[PDB]
Amino acid sequence: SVLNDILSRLDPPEAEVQIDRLITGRLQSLQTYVTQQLIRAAEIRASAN
Amino acid sequence: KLNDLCFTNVYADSFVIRGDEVRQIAPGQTGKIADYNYKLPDDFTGCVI
Known part of the structure; x- marks a missing residue:
C-alpha cells in the first residue's frame, strides 16, 4: 500500500x-x-442561499 | 504488418552471443552481458533476429 515501499522493492521495467x-x-x-x-x-450553497 | 507501417531513424545492431544468453537480450531482462555489455531500453520498439 506504500509508494515508497513498492518502488524500492520493484524495478521500473516490471514496476x-x-x-x-x-x-x-x-x-x-x-x-x-x-x-x-x-x-x-x-x-x-443552497443552504447558504 | 511491418510493410504497411512506415518509420524513420532505423538502426541495426551486430554481435554474436551463445544460445543460452539469447533470452537475456530483450527489454526488461537480466544477464551478465545484458547488464554489462548491451542493454535494451524499456520503451524499445524494435525486432531482434
Whole structure:
C-alpha cells in the first residue's frame, strides 16, 4: 500500500504493472472524494442561499 | 504488418552471443552481458533476429 515501499522493492521495467494500478485505484479515491465534495458543496450553497 | 507501417531513424545492431544468453537480450531482462555489455531500453520498439 506504500509508494515508497513498492518502488524500492520493484524495478521500473516490471514496476509499472503494480505502479500503474495503485495509481489507477488512488485516482478513484480522489474522484469519489472530489465528486462527493461538489454534491456536498451544492447542498451547502443552497443552504447558504 | 511491418510493410504497411512506415518509420524513420532505423538502426541495426551486430554481435554474436551463445544460445543460452539469447533470452537475456530483450527489454526488461537480466544477464551478465545484458547488464554489462548491451542493454535494451524499456520503451524499445524494435525486432531482434
